[PDB]
Design a protein around this ligand. Structure first.
Ligand SMILES: [Mg+2]
Ligand SMILES: [Mg+2]
Ligand SMILES: [Mg+2]
Ligand SMILES: [Mg+2]
Ligand SMILES: [Mg+2]
Ligand SMILES: [Mg+2]
Ligand SMILES: [Mg+2]
Ligand SMILES: [Mg+2]
Ligand SMILES: [Mg+2]
Ligand SMILES: [Zn+2]
Ligand SMILES: [Zn+2]
Ligand SMILES: [Zn+2]
Lengths: 99, 80, 97, 81, 196, 128, 100, 142
RNA sequence: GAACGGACAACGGCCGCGGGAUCCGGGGGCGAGAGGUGAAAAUCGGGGACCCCGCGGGGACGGGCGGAAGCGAAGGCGGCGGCCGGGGACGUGUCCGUUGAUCAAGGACGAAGGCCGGAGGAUCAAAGAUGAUUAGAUACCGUCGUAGUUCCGGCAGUAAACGAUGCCGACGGGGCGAGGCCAGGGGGCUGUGUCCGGGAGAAAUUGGAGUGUUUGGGCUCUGGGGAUAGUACGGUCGCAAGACAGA
C-alpha cells in the first residue's frame, strides 16, 4: 500500500506520497528530514540511521526519491558506515551488499 | 534407655515433631529500645520488620529462622 | 550382569551429560564416562633445561608449564594405558598414586 | 453440527487443489479473515480491507500492516526497537 | 633477495622502562606513503618482563602494541591490548574452586573504548566452591571496580594500572567481605574503538 | 647483549614441523624451514630428526639475516584438533638455541577454543 | 513469585471494592467540572486528546493525580470491574486503599 | 509426598500442646475480632491476618484469645469471601502464569505448571463444591 | 493444599552483550612444498600454497572451572547481564481442615534421527563421489560432498527414554563424604553419593532387591518354555516414515 502524507506549514499544504511502512497508521506524525528521530515511518539520511535497522524506500543516488526495497515485505539492512568517504554499505532484499 | 521417659538431653537434639510431645522452638519476646521507653513485643521467628514507633529505629529483621535483632536491643522471653 | 556399581560413568542425579570428543579417537564419549588425565609439565623438556640456561637473555628465567587436559574414550584409554589393568576387587580402587 | 472434522475453513475448496495446498492456505485464510484487537480502541474489530491495510471497523483506526496478518515478524521487529 | 629490507625500531609511550622493545623490518620504498602503507597497520606483543627487565614476577602479562606513526626509521606504537600469558591464564584456574570471570565494556577519560576481562578464583576459607549468588555478588563488584578505575582515568594511566595490577588487587580487597578470592587478575584488555 | 629479537613460530603437528622465524611484529618473515624440506619420506617429516635439521637451517639463515635472539611460540594444530605440540616440537627448540640463537620468553601459543565446532571423525570415532 | 503485591494492580481493585468510583469518560468530565474527583487512572489505550483534557482539568482542580495505566482498556478490565473494558476511572473516594 | 512433585518435605508449624490464653496481649476478645474484621476489609487474606496477628500483636493463634478461627470470625460477621483464600491463591497463580504465556508462548515449562495449578484448582473446587462452600456451577474465569 | 520469611537454583521463555575456535574472502611477508597416512595416493602449490601478521564476513558452539556437584516430571539443562515466569527444601503459634493415594478412558510434555512450510548454511556428515586397503571391500582409512546438523511454526511420538528396579506409605545398623535451609550443644530437617554389616537372594549383588511359607498396606501395569514375532489381520493415529495395540 501507499501512504498519503499531508504536510501543513504556514504557507501551503504539501501532499507527499510514500510507500506504506508496516506500522504506519492514519494520523501518524511522520518526520521527513536529515536527522529526524529513527522511529518507524520517518525518513532521514542513512548517516543518521544506526546500523542494523531495516529501512525501506532507500535512495540509490542522493535526493532520488527512494528506489530500493519498495515492494511488499522488503527492507534494507544498514550494515555499516564509512564515516570517512561518507559511504553506507547496505544489505538489499536479494542479499546483495550494496554501497 | 527408656522410650516412655526421654531425657531432657535427647529431646532438644531430636526434631520438634519427633519428640514425645511436639514442642515449640519459638516464643514471643519484648524488645527494648534505648531512646524509647515502651517495649514493643514480637515473635521469635518473625516474618515482619519491627520498629519502635517514636524515635524510629529498626529492632529486628526477619531471616530464615529466628529473626535477627538489629542494634542495641535488650530482649526478654515471655514464657509463663 | 552389572559390572560396575556406577555403570562406568560418574552420572548420578542427572539425565544427560553432554558428549565430548576423544583426544585420540575423536569418539563421542560423555564427559562423565570419559577418562580425563590433566597433565601439567614444563614446556621445555627436562633434558634440554641445561641448554636453555646457557641461552636465556634473562637471569633466573622460569621455564613455563604446559597445561593440557587429555580426555580419552574408554577404548583408547586402555590402549594408551591411561587406565591400568586391575583385578575385579582391584576395580573398586578410586585413589590416584 | 461441526460439518467438517479436519479442514474447517478450507472446506469451501472441496476436494480440489491438493491436500497440502489446502493445508497450507488454511492458516492464512484463518489469519486474513479474523478480527483482531484494535490497539487504539481496544475492541476486537480490526479487519483487513485490502492486502496490506488493516482497519478497525469500530473507531475507524486504519493502519498499514502485513498481507494476511496485521503484523509480520519483520514488521514487529522494526517496531519493537 | 634480502638486502632490500631495511630495519625500523619500535617505540612505545613512556609507561614502561623500555622505550624501544624491538626492531621490525620492511623492504625499501621510494615514497614515505608506501612505507606508511606497509607499516602503520602492523602490531606486536611484548611481555611485561621485557618492558620492565628487572622484575620477573610481573612477567605474566604481555602488552600488545599497534603502530600508528612512522617518522624516520622509528615506528611510534600506541597501546593495542593486554593479555595474560598462556602459562598464567591456565595456571590461575584450579579444580575444586569456583572460577569467577567478568568482562566490561568501558570508555576511559579519553575516548578509548576498552573491554576489560577479569578473572578470580575462590580460595580456602574440602572443595572451595562458592554459591552462584555469591559469584553474582562479586561480579557486580567486578563491574563497578572496572568502571571506576579506568573510566576515571585516561588510557596512559590505565596501562600503568594494568602493569602494576591495581585492577586485580582492588577486586581482592572489595570482594573479600563476601568471598575469599585469590589470583584476581585482569585476563585480557582489548581496544575496540579509538577516539579518532 | 646488543642482540636483535625475532619470533620463532614453531608449529609441530602430527605430520610436519614448521620452524618459522619472523620479526618481532610477525608480519615480516625472516626464514621458515619445515621438516619436510629435510627428509624425502612423507612419514619422516614430523620426526625430531627432521625438526632438528629444519631448526639448523632456520637458525643459520636467521643469524645471517640479522636475527640474533629469538622468542619462541610453540604450537600444535589446535582448534578442534590436537592442542599438544607434536613430536618434533622439542627438537626444533633444542636445535634452535644450540645453534647460536639466544632465546627469551618461550610460550605455548596454540589456538585453544572456548568450545569449538564439530570435529572430524564421526561419532564412533576414527576406527583403526 | 510472592502471591500478593501492593502496587496499582492491588490498590485499584481495593478502592473499587471499598470506595466510590465512576468508569467512563463522560463521568470523568462531569466530576472534574464539579471538583468531586480525587484520583484518575486512564489506560494507555485512551485517546490522547481526551486524555489531555483530563490532565488539563486535573491540573486546574487542586492537582488531581492522573495516572496512565501500563496497559489498555482490556487490561484495566483485568481488575475488579470486569463486565466491560475501562477507559478511565474517576475515584471519588477510596475507602481502604492508599491511592491518595 | 507432594501432590505434584516428588519432594517429601515436612516443614510445618507445630501447634502448642495447650492453648494458652495470652496474658501479654492487652486488648479484649472483642477488640481482637474488630481488628481482624478491619484487616479483612482492608484487603488482607486470612493467612496474612494471622501472620500480622502473630508478628505485630503477638497473638499466636486467635483461637487462643478468641476461641474462633479466622474463617469462623469472617463467617460470623458475613465477611466470608466468595471464593476461599486457598482457591483464590491458585486462581491468581493460574492467571499470573497465563498472562506470562500470552507473551511467551514457547514456555513449555510454564504450560506444564499451568496444567498443574489448574489441577490443584479443580481439585480444590471439587471439594469446595462438595461441602457447599462454593456454588456447584462455579467456573474459573477463562 | 494455601500463605509467609530469609535463602538457594546449568529450572524455563525472551531480550541484549560477549568469547574464542573452525571455515571462507582479502591484503602483506616468505620461497617450496603442503596436506594426509600404518604406508601412500587423491588434493592444493612460482597463477606464491603451507606457515606468519592484520582486516573482514558468516554460521555454529560455550573449552578450562566441571565434580559420582546442582536443577527439572521426564526428555533435559553449563559464557554474561536483564526481564517475565517457575520450582523444591528449610523456617514458622500463618490459613484451610481431610480437601487424599493410585489409575482404564482422556490430555500434555517427550533425546536423536525423520517429515512439512519458512529462514539460514561455518563445521561435521547419511546418500553419493573418489584415493587407497583387500582374495574381494558395496566397509573400516584419506579426501570431497547432498540431505541433515542450525533457527522459527507445526508434525511425529521413538530410544539400552536404564537405576534395565512403577507410585504412595510404616518400620528398619554403623562410618565417610563436597548439597540446601535451620540451630549453635561432633544438632535437626531434606536431598545426595559412598563403605561395612544386618536381612534378602539362584548368585552377581542389594537400605531395598529388607521387614515373605511366621506368605495379606493401598493402587496401576506386565510376564506365563523357546521360536513363529513385536510378524500378520482388523482397528486407531500419522503428510509419510511408521506408531499404538497385537495373534
Ligand atoms: Mg537418557
Ligand atoms: Mg498424584
Ligand atoms: Mg506436610
Ligand atoms: Mg598471499
Ligand atoms: Mg527432535
Ligand atoms: Mg531434526
Ligand atoms: Mg526444512
Ligand atoms: Mg569433509
Ligand atoms: Mg495393520
Ligand atoms: Zn525507641
Ligand atoms: Zn579414544
Ligand atoms: Zn479501534
Amino acid at each position: 500500500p501507499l501512504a498519503k502524507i499531508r504536510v501543513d506549514t504556514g504557507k501551503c499544504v504539501r501532499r507527499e506520497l510514500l510507500v506504506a511502512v508496516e506500522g504506519n497508521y492514519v494520523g501518524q506524525k511522520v518526520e521527513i528530514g536529515d536527522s529526524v528521530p529513527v522511529a518507524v515511518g520517518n525518513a532521514l539520511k542513512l548517516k543518521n540511521i544506526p546500523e542494523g535497522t531495516g529501512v525501506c524506500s532507500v535512495e540509490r543516488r542522493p535526493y532520488d526519491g527512494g528506489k530500493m526495497a519498495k515492494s511488499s515485505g522488503a527492507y534494507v539492512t544498514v550494515v555499516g558506515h564509512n564515516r570517512d568517504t561518507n559511504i553506507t554499505t547496505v544489505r538489499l532484499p536479494s542479499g546483495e551488499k550494496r554501497s | 534407655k527408656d522410650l516412655a521417659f526421654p531425657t531432657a538431653e535427647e529431646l532438644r537434639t531430636t526434631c520438634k515433631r519427633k519428640r514425645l510431645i511436639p514442642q515449640n522452638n519459638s516464643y514471643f519476646l519484648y524488645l527494648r529500645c534505648k531512646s524509647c521507653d515502651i517495649i514493643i513485643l514480637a515473635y521469635s521467628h518473625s516474618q515482619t520488620r519491627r520498629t519502635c514507633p517514636g524515635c524510629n529505629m529498626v529492632m529486628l529483621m526477619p531471616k530464615g529462622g529466628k529473626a535477627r535483632i538489629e542494634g542495641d536491643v535488650k530482649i526478654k522471653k515471655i514464657k509463663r | 550382569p552389572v559390572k560396575r556399581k556406577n555403570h562406568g560413568r560418574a552420572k548420578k542425579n542427572r539425565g544427560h551429560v553432554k558428549l565430548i570428543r576423544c583426544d585420540n579417537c575423536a569418539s563421542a564419549v560423555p564427559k562423565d564416562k570419559a577418562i580425563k588425565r590433566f597433565q601439567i609439565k614444563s614446556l621445555i623438556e627436562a633434558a634440554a633445561h641445561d641448554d636453555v640456561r646457557t641461552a636465556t637473555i634473562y637471569e633466573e628465567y622460569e621455564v613455563p608449564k604446559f597445561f593440557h587436559k587429555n580426555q580419552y574414550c574408554v577404548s583408547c584409554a586402555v590402549h594408551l594405558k591411561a587406565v591400568r589393568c586391575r583385578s575385579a576387587e582391584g576395580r573398586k580402587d578410586r585413589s590416584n598414586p | 453440527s461441526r460439518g467438517t472434522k479436519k479442514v474447517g475453513i478450507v472446506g469451501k475448496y472441496g476436494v480440489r487443489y491438493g491436500s497440502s495446498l489446502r493445508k497450507r492456505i488454511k492458516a492464512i485464510e484463518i489469519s486474513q479473515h479474523a478480527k483482531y484487537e484494535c490497539k487504539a480502541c481496544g475492541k476486537t474489530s480490526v479487519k483487513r480491507e485490502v492486502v496490506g491495510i488493516w482497519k478497525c471497523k469500530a473507531c475507524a483506526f486504519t493502519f498499514a500492516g502485513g498481507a494476511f496478518a496485521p503484523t509480520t515478524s519483520a514488521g514487529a521487529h522494526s517496531n519493537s526497537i | 633477495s634480502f638486502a632490500k629490507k631495511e630495519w625500523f625500531s619500535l617505540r612505545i609511550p613512556s609507561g614502561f622502562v623500555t622505550a624501544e622493545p624491538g626492531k621490525t623490518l620492511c623492504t625499501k620504498q621510494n615514497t614515505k606513503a608506501n612505507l606508511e602503507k606497509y607499516l602503520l597497520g602492523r602490531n606486536f606483543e611484548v611481555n611485561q618482563g621485557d618492558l620492565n627487565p628487572g622484575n620477573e614476577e610481573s612477567a605474566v602479562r604481555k602488552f600488545r602494541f599497534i603502530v600508528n606513526n612512522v617518522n624516520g626509521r622509528i615506528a611510534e606504537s600506541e597501546f593495542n591490548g593486554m593479555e595474560l600469558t598462556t602459562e598464567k591464564k591456565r595456571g590461575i584456574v584450579r579444580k575444586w574452586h569456583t572460577l569467577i570471570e567478568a568482562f566490561r565494556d568501558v570508555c576511559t577519560k579519553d575516548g578509548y573504548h576498552l573491554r576489560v576481562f577479569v578473572t578470580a578464583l575462590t580460595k580456602h576459607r574440602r572443595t572451595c566452591y562458592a554459591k552462584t549468588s555469591d559469584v553474582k555478588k562479586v561480579r557486580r563488584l567486578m563491574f563497578e571496580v572496572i568502571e571506576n578505575e579506568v573510566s576515571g582515568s585516561e588510557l596512559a594511566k590505565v596501562v600503568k594500572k594494568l602493569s602494576v595490577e591495581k585492577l586485580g588487587k582492588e577486586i581482592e580487597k572489595k570482594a573479600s567481605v563476601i568471598l575469599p578470592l585469590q589470583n584476581c587478575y585482569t585476563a585480557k584488555v582489548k581496544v575496540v574503538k579509538r577516539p579518532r | 647483549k646488543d642482540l636483535v629479537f625475532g619470533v620463532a613460530h614453531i608449529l609441530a603437528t602430527s605430520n610436519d614441523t614448521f620452524v618459522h622465524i619472523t620479526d618481532l611484529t610477525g608480519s615480516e618473515t625472516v626464514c621458515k624451514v619445515s621438516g619436510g624440506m629435510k627428509v624425502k619420506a612423507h612419514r619422516d617429516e614430523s620426526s625430531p630428526y627432521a625438526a632438528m635439521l629444519a631448526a639448523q637451517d632456520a637458525a643459520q639463515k636467521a643469524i645471517e639475516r640479522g636475527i640474533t635472539a629469538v622468542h619462541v611460540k610453540l604450537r600444535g594444530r589446535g582448534g578442534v584438533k590436537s592442542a599438544i605440540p607434536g613430536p618434533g616440537a622439542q627438537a626444533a627448540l633444542r636445535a634452535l638455541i644450540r645453534n647460536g640463537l639466544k632465546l627469551g620468553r618461550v610460550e605455548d601459543a596454540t589456538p585453544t577454543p572456548t568450545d569449538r565446532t564439530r570435529r572430524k571423525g564421526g561419532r564412533r570415532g576414527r576406527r583403526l | 513469585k510472592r502471591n500478593v503485591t501492593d502496587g496499582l494492580a492491588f490498590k485499584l481493585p481495593l478502592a473499587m471494592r471499598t470506595g466510590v468510583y465512576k468508569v467512563g469518560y463522560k463521568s470523568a468530565i462531569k466530576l472534574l467540572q464539579a471538583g468531586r474527583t480525587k484520583y484518575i487512572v486512564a489506560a494507555a489505550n485512551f485517546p490522547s486528546v481526551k486524555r489531555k483534557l483530563l490532565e488539563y482539568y486535573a491540573a486546574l482542580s487542586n492537582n488531581v493525580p492522573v495516572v496512565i495505566f501500563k496497559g489498555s482498556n482490556n487490561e484495566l478490565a483485568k481488575v475488579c470491574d470486569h463486565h466491560y473494558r475501562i477507559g478511565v476511572i474517576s475515584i471519588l473516594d477510596d475507602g481502604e486503599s492508599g491511592l491518595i | 509426598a507432594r501432590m505434584h512433585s516428588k519432594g517429601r518435605g515436612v516443614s510445618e508449624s507445630t501447634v502448642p500442646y495447650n492453648r494458652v490464653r495470652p496474658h501479654w496481649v492487652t486488648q479484649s476478645k472483642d477488640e481482637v475480632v474488630g481488628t481482624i474484621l478491619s484487616l479483612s476489609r482492608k484487603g488482607l487474606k486470612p493467612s496474612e491476618i494471622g501472620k500480622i496477628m502473630r508478628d505485630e500483636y503477638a497473638i499466636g493463634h486467635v483461637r487462643n484469645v478468641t476461641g474462633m478461627n479466622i474463617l469462623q470470625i469472617l463467617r460470623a460477621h458475613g465477611l466470608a469471601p466468595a471464593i476461599p483464600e486457598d482457591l483464590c491463591a491458585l486462581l491468581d497463580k493460574r492467571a499470573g502464569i497465563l498472562s506470562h504465556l500470552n507473551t511467551f508462548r514457547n514456555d513449555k515449562s510454564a504450560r506444564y505448571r499451568l496444567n498443574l495449578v489448574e489441577s490443584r484448582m479443580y481439585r480444590l473446587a471439587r471439594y469446595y463444591k462438595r461441602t457447599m462452600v462454593l456454588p456447584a456451577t462455579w467456573k474459573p474465569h477463562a
